């Protein structure tokens, strides 16, 4: 029914509006920090010697 | 020094080998491309490469190496290569016809067994026909008539020339049937609305004849002591067919063209 869909939508909107939010700058900083802290562990980002690389 | 019209053999052989080895390297070398049509294209390329290499070696054998006994082996190699090239052209035409006439079932492995039979029937016949230039009554002692092409007796050369016409007639018939199918499709497509087919056939079925006929006719009609100029003058048309076969059967294909561009670019 239209009324049921409207009620469900309005509860969904209220739930999505009453949740906590933070500045986008903090999200960008978190992503940058995670990328920096894990850059020394991904062969894909920086090649590795064939001695240890399985695919070599 | 190699007299006039001798350099033409060398340059033609080099040009044939340059383009056909590339086709061989792509079709046989690169992954995939093992479909029966591509196997029969690779066989044609190998035959043309052998013909070009044989021509180049024969030019070296003429003056540089100067070995009289090497000339017979190189002539046998050249005969084998040309026979294999023409057999591969016939094999490609018969494969096209069989793909059009078993379109639904052409994609079965009954074809791979046929492609292998054709690849082994085309190369056994080439070997058998190129074995004659050594022994088997080929004017090594001069008893049997020779001279039309000195390292080959006239009888064997005439046999090769007649086999050429045998192949040409069958190719004409097969391409006539393919043109019938093409016309059937063309008349149908137009009706839904409101010539590339005949133009492509004019090359596919025309260049082969215009290239190989002069040498074959000379072989049938040429006498033993005919002027040497005729052998060379009619050899360039024959060798031309070997330097346009990759253009006709390999260059036009979209995927082969894609790989060729990737290598070149």
């Amino acid at each position: 029914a239209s009324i049921a869909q409207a009620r469900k939508l309005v509860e969904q909107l209220k739930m999505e509006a009453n949740i906590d939010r933070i500045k986008v700058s903090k999200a960008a900083a978190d992503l940058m920090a995670y990328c920096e802290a894990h850059a020394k562990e991904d062969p894909l980002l920086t090649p590795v010697p064939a001695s240890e690389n399985p695919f070599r | 020094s190699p007299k006039a019209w001798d350099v033409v053999l060398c340059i033609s052989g080099t040009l044939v080998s340059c383009e056909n080895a590339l086709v061989v390297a792509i079709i046989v070398g690169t992954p995939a491309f093992r479909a029966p049509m591509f196997l029969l294209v690779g066989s044609l390329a190998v035959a043309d490469l052998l013909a070009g290499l044989g021509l180049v070696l024969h030019f070296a054998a003429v003056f540089c190496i100067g070995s009289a006994e090497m000339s017979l082996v190189l002539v046998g190699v050249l005969a084998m290569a040309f026979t294999a090239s023409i057999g591969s052209l016939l094999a490609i035409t018969v494969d096209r016809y069989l793909s059009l006439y078993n379109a639904l079932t052409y994609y079965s492995e009954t074809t791979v067994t046929r492609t292998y039979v054709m690849l082994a029937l085309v190369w056994g016949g080439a070997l058998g026909l190129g074995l004659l230039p050594v022994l088997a009554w080929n004017c090594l002692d001069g008893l049997t008539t020779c001279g039309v092409v000195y390292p080959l007796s006239k009888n064997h050369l005439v046999v090769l020339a007649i086999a050429f016409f045998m192949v040409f007639g069958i190719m004409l018939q097969l391409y006539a049937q393919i043109c019938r199918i093409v016309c059937r499709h063309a008349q149908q497509i137009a009706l839904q609305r409101h010539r590339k087919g005949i133009a492509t056939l004019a090359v596919v079925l025309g260049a082969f004849a215009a290239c190989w006929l002069p040498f074959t006719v000379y072989c049938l009609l040429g006498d033993a002591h005919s002027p040497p100029l005729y052998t060379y003058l009619t050899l360039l048309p024959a060798t031309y067919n070997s330097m346009i076969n990759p253009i006709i059967y390999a260059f036009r294909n979209q995927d082969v063209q894609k790989v060729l561009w990737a290598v070149c670019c």
């Binding site: 009620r7 309005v10 739930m15 986008v24 999200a27 991904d42 695919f55 | -």
Partner: protein, 337 residues
Amino acid sequence: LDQLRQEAEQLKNQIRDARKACADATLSQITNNIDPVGRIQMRTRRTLRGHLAKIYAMHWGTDSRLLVSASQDGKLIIWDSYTTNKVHAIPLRSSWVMTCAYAPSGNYVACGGLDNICSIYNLKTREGNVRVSRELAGHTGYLSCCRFLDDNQIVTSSGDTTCALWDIETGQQTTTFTGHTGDVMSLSLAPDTRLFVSGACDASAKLWDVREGMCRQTFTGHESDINAICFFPNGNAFATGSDDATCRLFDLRADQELMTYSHDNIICGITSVSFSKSGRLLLAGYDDFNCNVWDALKADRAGVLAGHDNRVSCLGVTDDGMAVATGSWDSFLKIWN
């Protein structure tokens, strides 16, 4: 009844205002002085081939050694990447398979597609072979993507705009998720296995909690449909492909779009997306059979893995980022490294 519509419109306006207020900066602006990646000259190192038809999905195990690939020819061949040796040739009841999974335990596999059934297979058997363990039905929608929570739980997303959680023991739909309007193209489990997002066909991406069983957020920053979803390694973000040729990145806490990747030369939609181990790279496959390695920070292309034909069905990454499998419709799985 119109009062409900007015209230919904006011709530949407409030959400927009809150997002604008929280939009104090952008990822592109922040990354104006970050170290560029440069150019990554990755080349194919292992062409598995073998597959008899166009591939549509693939996923590896926890040990990053054995990989499971699913193709629309009905084969689920398991390959040993190190030596290329095949380990199994699990046939599939339904030829059309759009997804597959490899359980963390390393012995259970599952797949599904237009058959509407998420078949389950176990590699460990008394006969040393693979036999059907359980078939999950009752979805009324083609399975777009599935994942393994553990050796006894599987979560699947169908085309009916609903995601469902199943229990292998009793084969029952323990929890059901709903709220989307378009087809759910894909989902990606979080590293903690608690949260997981899903990209609907209507450009709306929603986050759900498996235990709670209800949605939490909704992102509608895409102008067209979303083709693939992949969770960030840190478990707080996820990339989003689309048919409009634009890739975007969202953050759960941000609650809004942060970055968008697109170029004038690119006019082709993205088929699949998968983040790298470190999360600094955003590999994606395009409709022009030309995979591109985007940068999550610079947003500039970091390299093109050309070589696939007619599509790039799906990508993949390891638990340690040791190799990438680039599935394609050409039936060849090329492992780049």
